[PDB]
């Protein structure tokens, strides 16, 4: 029973050891509910993590006049045709810009969204302008006003056009493939996002009746339909949680299996862990790290879209590197400035120099124990690394960012044997 | 009395107009509060803002044992005889990382101090290496441990030394120059700060029986001191509040005059100004601005060490160039990342392109009120000038930030015409 | 007859009008050639740009002892059967570091090369550490001595490895899909450069007897086979080339019709076209673009690996945009500093801002005729379009620069009605 | 004799041991020569070093209609009365872009001036906006035109003003300087360049009757006079030229003394060096550095203005912290892609990451001896350096380059007894 005011308390020192299951991708989940919208009939999402922005989608959907069902199964059943309020309030958009998400399947929908226009988030520069210009380039007329994304889709529903994008977006991708499925005719997005969570989404839509091509490579071709239905559909595996484990892992000289995962999402990730040393090897739906007996080895890192290696992975191999043989640079060309997790490690003795969008991060044997400060919902999961590869006691607090996360990152760190404890707010 | 959920409503459209008084500078304050900490015999510190860093730093000093006397002017005396507690907690530390400015001061007076490592804040990358390697060049022996910096000066006290500043920093230089005012002969400090509140801090460490000569230079030299005594002080007008109501003028194209400032200390913003077409005079004392009509013209602006143009009037300049004639280019090189003000601008309507370190702003003749967020202490203020621009309504909350940078700024916008309110908490 | 002292001498201020033939790509006619020493009987290429850069690779091919026969019709065979040498000398990969593409093919054929390693490039930083970890990967032990990378494979010959790309590099793919193609086992190669070229080489490289397959994609798998026969290749219409005629046109006002072209190897480039106004039209083999007469509306521009708009537009957008109507940001993620053209359009009274990898360019209604220094073999083709839109002559020295990247480039836009000249030297 | 196609051959290997004497400032020879335009009797230039840059300003001069006279003692006296021709033409700026020194002198002593506008360096990004603004701040109007900025001063000459630098510019500072010198009233310059040759030239200016007060610090007050006459300066020691034989040296793990320099100007870098392991000892005029044979150790620099560390010994960091024991991160912050030396480097087997400003030295015992190419004046002393370390020898082309930056290199280092040859062209 999570509660706003948790703290982690870890004590750092053991390798571990044992074996967990990885929980469905937050960030397919997310799209995925979003695109319940487009149906008739009822949507079943499965393999839900259990974490906080899955919550927050909830309650949103329910701002909508739309009460999704959670089963004994703890599946999430929508069905959005009670949906009576056409709005994303700013009131839950400013807890989770992700939300957005909603734009492009209610507009393509209902022929009418208002959501709020997402404002800072402490990450870095995140506007949404592709996603505006994406459905204007379907004939929806938009304007910004009391905060708001006020869009409405031409007589006869939005229609199919060209986009290119300038820069790749995941779920600037993911919104108009969402609009795409119900406009009129053609629609081809280019330089379109290849992230895993994208596929899924268009395998999802394409369960419940549509026609998308081409996820997974640079132009995904959608030819519209005027309908879709419900379906039952089971999330992939999140590679984020997968390669924090795997970190966590190597960075306490550890070993690891991870179930109900999938390598194949993950490649970058893999063979940098190889890279710094770890034994890996892997089946269709598993993967084994073991260091056998080894420190790391101190490695570079270059963040970029996916197919490379993930912005929401850097964090953590800093971690790693921080108690790793050697000197790592960490470089970020996705969000150049996300680094407040070097800060907090630098209380616990990390020896980390940042200029801009470069990390140099100095493996020492071991970090010192001290209270820190999460403020990132993936990147915070290296405090959690940290606090397990330092001597005596890591205190975190603002858990609140790591349970939108991540599935119960204590629990599933306890069967490894790390010793770590939830502290009720 | 405010409260920690006080929000402002700002209803735009208004050209500003009238006189308010500028208040003393917050950060001459800070450092000057915590050089009280060398005296033998009390010291009293005046013109103070009336914000909320420095009742943190008076909490800071009760918790180690000082309780500082205000007076019915809000004039405070320290009297740091009765200190029973070297320890500056995390607890505090965590809420103001200026709390560090007592490092340096409690080592040299008191021969020891354990002061919190700052961790992360999100203005951008501030780690503090270059105060402790110059505590270090002064003799003192540091090590990190627990999250505190843990200080013991030689037998005998601090040493002077010769310090060369990699990069110019403005509280390292405080903190060193603090230190060095009671260590045991000559202290060099090279690439020093020239920030107007490094001068003002030795004037008062001199009025207070010091010898720090070159303050406002390159280079400082410190002959250290036996004792240091009860000098009564009066801190210098706010550069950043003085560049703040001055903008909140020209950007509305309105004027406005300031009483007990120095047009001195902000040549820089003053230039800027007028490029952007104000009209203005100074006195010894006091600077009128006057738009006399006309929309301001985009300027650039490129942020750097004092005397150049200040990273805490870099987001304000940009809320005038959102309504300004024109393209005008704001390139941060202190503070890369410190852009939030700019999406939360971007929900007003603002026409703004980040890339890196370099904001492009595109002027629109008005903006659209819409709820927005504070996060930064100095640079929020540029949402309450947005406000001032903006059609119709623009509600900020976490008000808390800009609580602690500026003295009351809703009451010395009302008194220049603005429609603006406190909604408390 | 070209000379390295040859100048062009340019009268801007007319519309361009007329039509003319694009040539094979420089950038696959340079991989296709390095993969011909992978052939047991002669290969011949056809479609090749007479540009110097061709020129330097067969003297290269010359050096080692393969004398390539120039038909009548301009295609080159080459039988590599009367090798000599496998060395790369420095003397010409000094002057072309594309030479390095002949170390992948060299190793793999005969077991062992010495390839001088490439310097500096005054585009800016371009390591190849990506070509010699890749090698590796494959079973290659490199070595760097004298100024020589010394390869040698493995007893037996190279052998199929996994490779994953940190960074997208094309002539990294290029090098590794081609010592792949006779190394003993499956190659799999991740985050591959998805150029129109890398495609082009794989359809040679399988014209030839190997099986490479999924060039095009982020991820390429080649089958080894244990020796390639000859073929006769076509190479593909240059897409640089395409894109620059089209910008030359719309710059000036103009129209232009290109046969033996392919839109789709340039969707990013045409898109931005239509954003500054161009009306184009499209066959399977030619692009039409119409102004209109009407001056270009400024574009923003952002570089990245294929299909995004590519590093080799930039500049030529830069010149359209110094005389569009309005203000463009031009931004490298590819060459962060590639924008010495800038400088030189300054002297033509460009208005244009850079900080970092970032351009600001306000266009202006017509520059002015200015001396200029060519430095980048494609880049440099801007300021041929910035001499098409100044009032009265420019000069351009050093366009040996130019005839690396062009096939006379001056004679081309003759044909289009532009006033353009070459000074002999 | 030094000829435009001469190499240098180095073989590495030395300990360096001596003693030789320094030359004067090259950037304040130069800037001095422009101020003699000022002068209406003739000014002589002493302790003026032997390079190419002078012999530049002197054709200069030259193509101008002034005759220099080089006397027994190697000065060079500057009658400017002779003067037929106000016109710093493309021919000679192209090469020297410094040349643009003359335009603030031209301007005051003789109401207009035509200087072309220096194109690209390939250094970066150098504009000279601030030079133009400066001098409009002084009332000159300026035109671009046929790649000349022609400029013209109002009624009764150049009027006293006050100018801001948005950026430190050393020689913006200095232009603006002389053509305050003679200008009608006060000017006071803000952000000023506190470079010594800054303070060299207002030296003597004030020598030949001037009123230049302030020169060092930021702030510049300048009171016009309305005649200049002669004086016979003796220009201060180059602490660039002083800085670089330090560093071979120490790379070498060899000592050195040099004499008729001066500690003082070069503070920052003595202070890298002793970090590095130097041993350090200086009087009054001179500087003695002994390593003891010891291997440097790592060290990190950042470059900016003065008094921090200066971009011009950037590379010759690179080069020492190259065969350094340990990792060191250089960074730029003035010319934030100077760094082709790294690319020559790595052709001798340095270990070198670059990231934008940012280049990661992972020290190796030796260099390995190849062939490499000079580019920068100043920056490419540091292939001498690296051939000094490296095993073998070396032989850079393009020497040049390095004989405009510094009196006969290769004469000075046989005196500290490494083996160097020049092979003349
Ligand atoms: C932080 C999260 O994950 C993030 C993850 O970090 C990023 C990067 O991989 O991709 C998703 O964000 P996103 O879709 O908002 O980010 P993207 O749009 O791909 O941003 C990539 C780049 O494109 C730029 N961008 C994006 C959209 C747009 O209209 N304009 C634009 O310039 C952004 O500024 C950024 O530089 C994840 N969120 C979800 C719901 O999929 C999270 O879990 O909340
Ligand atoms: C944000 C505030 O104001 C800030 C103001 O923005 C900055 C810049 O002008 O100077 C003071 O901070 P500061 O002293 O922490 O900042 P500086 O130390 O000058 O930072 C300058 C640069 O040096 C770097 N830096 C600084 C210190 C150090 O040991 N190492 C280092 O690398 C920082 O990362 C930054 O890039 C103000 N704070 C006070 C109490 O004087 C505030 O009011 O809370
Ligand atoms: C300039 C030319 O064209 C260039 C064109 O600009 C670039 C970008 O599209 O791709 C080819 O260069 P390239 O293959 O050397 O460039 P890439 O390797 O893709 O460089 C991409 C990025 O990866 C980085 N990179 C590349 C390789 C490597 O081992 N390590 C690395 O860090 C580079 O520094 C750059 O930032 C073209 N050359 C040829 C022969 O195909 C030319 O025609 O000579
Ligand atoms: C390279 C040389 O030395 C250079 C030395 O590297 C630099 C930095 O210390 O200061 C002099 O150049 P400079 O005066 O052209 O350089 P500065 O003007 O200080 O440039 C500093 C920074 O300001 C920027 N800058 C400068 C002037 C201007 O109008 N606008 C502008 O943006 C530049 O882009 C650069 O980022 C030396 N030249 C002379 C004659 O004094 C040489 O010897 O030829
Ligand atoms: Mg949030
Ligand atoms: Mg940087
Ligand atoms: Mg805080
Ligand atoms: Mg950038
Ligand atoms: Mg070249
Ligand atoms: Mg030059």
Redesign the interface.
Known sequence: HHHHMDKLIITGGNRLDGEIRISGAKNSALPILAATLLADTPVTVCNLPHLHDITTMIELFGRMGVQPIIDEKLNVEVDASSIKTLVAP?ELV?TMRASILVLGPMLARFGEAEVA??????I????VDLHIRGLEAMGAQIE????YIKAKAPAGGLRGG?F?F???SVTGTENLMMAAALANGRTVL??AA?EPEVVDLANCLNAMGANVQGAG???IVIEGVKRLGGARYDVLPDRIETGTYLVAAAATGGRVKLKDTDPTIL??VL?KLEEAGAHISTGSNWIELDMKGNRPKAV?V?T?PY???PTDMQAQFISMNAVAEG?G?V?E?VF??R??????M????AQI??????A?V?GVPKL??????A?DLRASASLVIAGLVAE?DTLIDRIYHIDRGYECIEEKLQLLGAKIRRVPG
């Open positions: 700013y400013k226009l997402p404002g800072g988030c402490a870095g520069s995140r506007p910004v006003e009391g905060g060209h290119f300038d820069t790749v280019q330089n290849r490579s640079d132009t490649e970058a063979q570079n270059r970029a197919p490379a290696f000197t640079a470089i060309t150049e400035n680094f407040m997790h070097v800060y907090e630098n209380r616990m003795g120099l940042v200029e801009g969008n470069t140099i100095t010192k124990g001290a209270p820190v400060m403020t005596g």
